[PDB]
Amino acid sequence: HSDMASKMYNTDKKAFLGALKYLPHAILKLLENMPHPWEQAKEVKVLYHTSGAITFVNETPRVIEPVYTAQWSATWIAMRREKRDRTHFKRMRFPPFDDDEPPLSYEQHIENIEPLDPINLPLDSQDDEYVKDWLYDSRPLEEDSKKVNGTSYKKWSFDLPEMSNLYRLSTPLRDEVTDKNYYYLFDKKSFFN
Amino acid sequence: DEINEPPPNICEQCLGDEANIRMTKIPQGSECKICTLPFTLYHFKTSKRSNNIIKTLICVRCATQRNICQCCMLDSRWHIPIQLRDHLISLVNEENVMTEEAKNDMMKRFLSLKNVKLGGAQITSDPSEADNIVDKLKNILLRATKSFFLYNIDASIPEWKITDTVSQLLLSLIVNHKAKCGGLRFQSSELGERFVSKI
Amino acid sequence: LLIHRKGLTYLHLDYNFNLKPTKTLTTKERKKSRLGNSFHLMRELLKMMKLIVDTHVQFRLGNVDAFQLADGIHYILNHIGQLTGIYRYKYKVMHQIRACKDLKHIIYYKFNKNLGKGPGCGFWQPAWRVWLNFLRGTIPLLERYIGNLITRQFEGRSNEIVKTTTKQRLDAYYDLELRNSVMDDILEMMPESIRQKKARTILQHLSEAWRCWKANIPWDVPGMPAPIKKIIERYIKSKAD
Amino acid sequence: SWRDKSAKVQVKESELPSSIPAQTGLTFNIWYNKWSQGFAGNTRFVSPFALQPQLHSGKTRGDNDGQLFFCLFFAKGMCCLGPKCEYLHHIPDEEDIGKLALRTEVLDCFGREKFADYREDMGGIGSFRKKNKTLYVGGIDGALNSKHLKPAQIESRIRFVFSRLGDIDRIRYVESKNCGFVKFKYQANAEFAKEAMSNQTLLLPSDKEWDDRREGTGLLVKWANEDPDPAAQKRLQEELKLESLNMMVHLINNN
Amino acid sequence: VRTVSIHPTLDLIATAGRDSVIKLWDMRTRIPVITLVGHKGPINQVQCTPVDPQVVSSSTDATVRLWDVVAGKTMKVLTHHKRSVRATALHPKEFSVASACTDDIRSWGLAEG
Amino acid sequence: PLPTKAEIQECTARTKSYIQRLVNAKLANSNNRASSRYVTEANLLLNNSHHIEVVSKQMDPLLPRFVGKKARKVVAPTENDEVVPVLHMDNEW
RNA sequence: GGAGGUCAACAUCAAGAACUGUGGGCCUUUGCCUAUAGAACUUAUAACGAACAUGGUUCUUGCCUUUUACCAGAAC
RNA sequence: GUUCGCGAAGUAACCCUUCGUGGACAUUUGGUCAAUUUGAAACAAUACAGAGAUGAUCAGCAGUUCCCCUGCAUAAGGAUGAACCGUUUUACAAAGAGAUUU
Ligand SMILES: O=P(O)(O)O[C@H]1[C@@H](OP(=O)(O)O)[C@@H](OP(=O)(O)O)[C@@H](OP(=O)(O)O)[C@@H](OP(=O)(O)O)[C@H]1OP(=O)(O)O
Ligand SMILES: [Mg+2]
Ligand SMILES: [Mg+2]
Numbered sequence A: 001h002s003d004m005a006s007k008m009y010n011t012d013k014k015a016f017l018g019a020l021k022y023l024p025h026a027i028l029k030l031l032e033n034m035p036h037p038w039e040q041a042k043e044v045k046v047l048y049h050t051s052g053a054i055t056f057v058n059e060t061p062r063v064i065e066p067v068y069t070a071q072w073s074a075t076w077i078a079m080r081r082e083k084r085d086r087t088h089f090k091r092m093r094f095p096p097f098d099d100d101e102p103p104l105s106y107e108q109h110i111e112n113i114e115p116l117d118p119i120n121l122p123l124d125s126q127d128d129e130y131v132k133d134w135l136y137d138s139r140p141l142e143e144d145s146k147k148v149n150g151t152s153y154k155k156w157s158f159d160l161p162e163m164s165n166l167y168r169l170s171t172p173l174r175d176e177v178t179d180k181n182y183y184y185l186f187d188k189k190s191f192f193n
Numbered sequence B: 001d002e003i004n005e006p007p008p009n010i011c012e013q014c015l016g017d018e019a020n021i022r023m024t025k026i027p028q029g030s031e032c033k034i035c036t037l038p039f040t041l042y043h044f045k046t047s048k049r050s051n052n053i054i055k056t057l058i059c060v061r062c063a064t065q066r067n068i069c070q071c072c073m074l075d076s077r078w079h080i081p082i083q084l085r086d087h088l089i090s091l092v093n094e095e096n097v098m099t100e101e102a103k104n105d106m107m108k109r110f111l112s113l114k115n116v117k118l119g120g121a122q123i124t125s126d127p128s129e130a131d132n133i134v135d136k137l138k139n140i141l142l143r144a145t146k147s148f149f150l151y152n153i154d155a156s157i158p159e160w161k162i163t164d165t166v167s168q169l170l171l172s173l174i175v176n177h178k179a180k181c182g183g184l185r186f187q188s189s190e191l192g193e194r195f196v197s198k199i
Numbered sequence C: 001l002l003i004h005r006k007g008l009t010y011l012h013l014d015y016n017f018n019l020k021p022t023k024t025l026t027t028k029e030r031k032k033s034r035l036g037n038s039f040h041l042m043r044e045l046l047k048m049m050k051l052i053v054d055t056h057v058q059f060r061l062g063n064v065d066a067f068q069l070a071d072g073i074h075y076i077l078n079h080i081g082q083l084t085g086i087y088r089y090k091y092k093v094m095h096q097i098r099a100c101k102d103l104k105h106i107i108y109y110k111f112n113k114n115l116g117k118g119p120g121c122g123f124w125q126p127a128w129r130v131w132l133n134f135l136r137g138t139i140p141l142l143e144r145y146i147g148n149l150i151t152r153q154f155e156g157r158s159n160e161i162v163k164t165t166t167k168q169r170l171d172a173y174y175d176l177e178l179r180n181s182v183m184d185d186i187l188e189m190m191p192e193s194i195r196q197k198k199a200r201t202i203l204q205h206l207s208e209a210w211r212c213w214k215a216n217i218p219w220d221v222p223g224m225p226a227p228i229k230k231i232i233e234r235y236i237k238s239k240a241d
Numbered sequence D: 001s002w003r004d005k006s007a008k009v010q011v012k013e014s015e016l017p018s019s020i021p022a023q024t025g026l027t028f029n030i031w032y033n034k035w036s037q038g039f040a041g042n043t044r045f046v047s048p049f050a051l052q053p054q055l056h057s058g059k060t061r062g063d064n065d066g067q068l069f070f071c072l073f074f075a076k077g078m079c080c081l082g083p084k085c086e087y088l089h090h091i092p093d094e095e096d097i098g099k100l101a102l103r104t105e106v107l108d109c110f111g112r113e114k115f116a117d118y119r120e121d122m123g124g125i126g127s128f129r130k131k132n133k134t135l136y137v138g139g140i141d142g143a144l145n146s147k148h149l150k151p152a153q154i155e156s157r158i159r160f161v162f163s164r165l166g167d168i169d170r171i172r173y174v175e176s177k178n179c180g181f182v183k184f185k186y187q188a189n190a191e192f193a194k195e196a197m198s199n200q201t202l203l204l205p206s207d208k209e210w211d212d213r214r215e216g217t218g219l220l221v222k223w224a225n226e227d228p229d230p231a232a233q234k235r236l237q238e239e240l241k242l243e244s245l246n247m248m249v250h251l252i253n254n255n
Numbered sequence E: 001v002r003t004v005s006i007h008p009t010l011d012l013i014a015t016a017g018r019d020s021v022i023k024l025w026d027m028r029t030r031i032p033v034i035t036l037v038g039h040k041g042p043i044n045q046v047q048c049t050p051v052d053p054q055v056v057s058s059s060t061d062a063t064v065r066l067w068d069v070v071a072g073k074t075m076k077v078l079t080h081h082k083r084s085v086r087a088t089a090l091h092p093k094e095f096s097v098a099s100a101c102t103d104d105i106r107s108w109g110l111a112e113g
Numbered sequence F: 001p002l003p004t005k006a007e008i009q010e011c012t013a014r015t016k017s018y019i020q021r022l023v024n025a026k027l028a029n030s031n032n033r034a035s036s037r038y039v040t041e042a043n044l045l046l047n048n049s050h051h052i053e054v055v056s057k058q059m060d061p062l063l064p065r066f067v068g069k070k071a072r073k074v075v076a077p078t079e080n081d082e083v084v085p086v087l088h089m090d091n092e093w
Numbered sequence G: 001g002g003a004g005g006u007c008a009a010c011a012u013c014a015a016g017a018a019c020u021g022u023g024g025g026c027c028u029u030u031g032c033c034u035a036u037a038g039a040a041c042u043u044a045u046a047a048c049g050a051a052c053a054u055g056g057u058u059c060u061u062g063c064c065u066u067u068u069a070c071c072a073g074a075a076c
Numbered sequence H: 001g002u003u004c005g006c007g008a009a010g011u012a013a014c015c016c017u018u019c020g021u022g023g024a025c026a027u028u029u030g031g032u033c034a035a036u037u038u039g040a041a042a043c044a045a046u047a048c049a050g051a052g053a054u055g056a057u058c059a060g061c062a063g064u065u066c067c068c069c070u071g072c073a074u075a076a077g078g079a080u081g082a083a084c085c086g087u088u089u090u091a092c093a094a095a096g097a098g099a100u101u102u
């Protein structure tokens, strides 16, 4: 369905017009599985029309909340260190392609190239012992039936040293207010009053 | 309108001989060829492993007005076309019962909404008068009864009757029916002598 | 394929999703080719998605870096009011834009503490959240809009369109129904059949009597029957009140 | 006979004519596969292909399945499947016409639906209100590349071309008007020969423009109107009377 | 529109105006479910009735109609008035209707006419 | 007389069933997916005897449904043979 | 039988602080009183979602050439 | 193809093969739709004019219509969107007067 000039594809063209009710949903389900800075490339589970009209990514991204807080804190610290370390940071130019260039095919120009290096703040070997081997995976303990229910990835339960390690490692994004008398006249109900 | 739509009328020659058929109802499928207006298209198949799929083509108003099938366009009683049914009704009782056929796409979708049972369907929509005119057709049927140069060909006989008789009396044939110069030509002169011998 | 079904072949939709004409249009053609808010809103959404997917493509081909990727798409989600042009089709989205701009202020002065002024932030989680929450709100709206557009494509326009009485057509509708109301009450007074050509000549006294009311001229008709003058004087006092 | 050999492939799939036709206008439309900002009043051309009824015809895949219908592209001259084609690849004879009889009332020999009334210009498929059997051949001066050819020879070439596509009831070439009226004996032969001989030529190799036949326009086969010849009208009335008597016999025997 | 009646037992509205039709609105989905197409002028009055002459209307073409709302056609047209019927009324304890004209007040039975 | 308490009930039930069938059809032909959560909920014999089974088909969600549907302008033949009589009685203006 | 599923269907999820079932009595079924068995999930700086968008109608405003598109408070 | 048997043959000795053989498992896809002219989108170019109530130049709101186009539209635009400007005879009678005939 790159070029469709036949008496065939009279139905497929009408399908292409019919899918435009459904393009915000396909854009949403694509964009909310934007990979993350600590990943190279992730495989999504898509659902397409047989004539090739629209292609919905059919997958919801579930994360553990302290593990995700610690992942964003690691890449926060690494991006700060890299901004300090570089003298010349080349912010890329926009829009990235020419206007008359068709989008290049994944199967030829992209898939045969070996990927590049993600953010990945380098962890210590013994201070970060319990979380080192899985901190930067896609679903970090997707198959470890003691620390997760299953590959449906719905519930989580950790020990104390793993949880403490994620507590220390996520220092730049913790709340760090432990008394409720901090929000004396900034609570929700003072705002309503 | 469509909350009480009549069931279709499919010809018994169209449904086939299998005693159980499944047919698909699509509530606004095609639009009618006579009526220009939507209807509920049905598309069955005769046996399950038949090759082709019969579908209905005309509306149910348009089928009832002509007293015809939908898949077949034939008269639902006698199983003949409309144009020959109107000739048989017109030839006996002498009424010129001919069916009126509308152009101007407003006028055809006007005519399809009135309920008048168009020209020759008034007789065969009832069994009594449809049997009476067959009784009269009995009376009309009772009162009823290598190259050769052809010449004096009858003015209304075609080439293929000549060729079929020669294939019985056993190629090419060029017959101008005006000048009657029937320039028959066989493929072998032995076949020419054969045809000369048989006559 | 929508543009080429509609008959518009002189509009060019290049691969970065811009719609520009290939010639200088006539006015008849500019009437035939005003695409709606719905088309251009879908078009700018596809453009935005295109920019994000192209920057991850650039990361894959090895032209850019992990940090330049993160800074690039952080810049993208912050600068949609300059990179796309969605603000002009659904101006409510300026809320989302101002939110992203405000979020930049509270992220940069946590990021740029003790390290200068350059590019390279790339903490794109909160801006990403803002644009996803915009998308789930404009799913049902754009399904409604594109549903009506595509059914006008396949199925024409409904001929049954009636006009709501608005501010624009109120002083006309008052006239239509005033004259119907007058002509009924005068048709009932007559002992004859009026046969209908006379009615439109009877209402000219209603028009003349209103013109005489505005100009404060007393409106006596010399050979007028009495209850018909009473009816007209009644309805003109109504209109004047 | 054609019952022996399997049907030869007529042209390869790679050697098929492409779409995106002819570069007529300026900009190409996509939803309709045609050209826009354009100028067009001719849009016709000589068809490159033609069937050879003795060389090409034979058994196929969907002849063992008993399909009623004939291949449109076998007739037009470009059927690129051969022994694998679903449809039939031979000229309609009495046996094949006898099987189509329930379906020819509604739709074509090729299986296409007949509309209520013909067209502005007597176009492609027939009308189901009338069993027309006479075809109008015209545009002969474009079909011969303006080779003036002593009209009895033109009638001989039109005789020979249609003699292979079925049985002929009668042939007439008109002197005053460059046209011919060809009546077949059955209807399916008329439908087959109409779609088989559209956009073709009358030239055949020893005719001095055989290498140059591809330029031009090619002839038109359309549907003939009613004949205003009163001899033809009285012949039609007599044939209608005899068909009426036959159907009277059958309707009396079904009571 | 110049007229509202409310159905006694079925959650409907019947309205009418210069449109020359009667619209029988569903009350929940606000859909114009059944449209009664009979008259030849604006309708002045519409009365709702719980048994089969269920809608009784009166237009300015000197007719009064008793409608079958399930079928969609008219049960009976009353043509006795000479001019426009401007006012009607249902009787609370009688199952009869009264129709007024320019000087012609009559009383009609329902379920026969 | 006033109409009896049973005929009010029979009329109310029959007409309520009819109005609910019309409302379900109007909400089921709509393009809104949200309307089908507001609806409130074959074999036929084609001749002397044939016993057919009418099944529906499952359609593509992207292709248009009711492909015959289109906006047309129609006139209707106003046809009657009920003659009905008009039963009337027998310079200043 | 056991573990699991980015598998499906069907019930259910915001209310006298609030649920269902059963036996007995009173009224004449509903309801009231009395004795009993069970209640998963959600909820008290109140709610399924330590997250948070858009649409309609009617008021009150703000930009002010008019309508879309809008400014930002309220009720449904 | 798998599995449970039931016989023969090779080594046998209770296994392992070749072979025949009864049972079990698994059971009807797809088409409303064929691949350039002949079954149906349309605009655009050259030529003429250069927008309604006008003496002249304009703001508009409507209406009726088997005309619609752009539009998310029940908003609003399309020259006040446009067409509207023509053709017009019988519910025909009463009184009086002047000539023709009986
Ligand atoms: O938006 P841009 O013009 O591209 O520049 C913005 C930003 O503008 P806004 O604050 O208006 O979004 C600031 O520039 P100012 O107009 O406030 O001076 C800011 O500067 P500060 O750091 O001084 O706040 C910062 O520039 P920098 O990259 O130096 O942080 C940043 O640039 P980005 O566009 O790269 O975020
Ligand atoms: Mg106007
Ligand atoms: Mg307007």
Ligand SMILES: [Zn+2]
Binding pocket: B032, B033, B034, B035, B036, B037, B039, B058, B059, B060, B061, B062, B112
């Ligand atoms: Zn029809």
Ligand SMILES: [Zn+2]
Binding pocket: D071, D072, D073, D074, D079, D080, D081, D082, D085, D086, D087, D088, D089
């Ligand atoms: Zn073939």
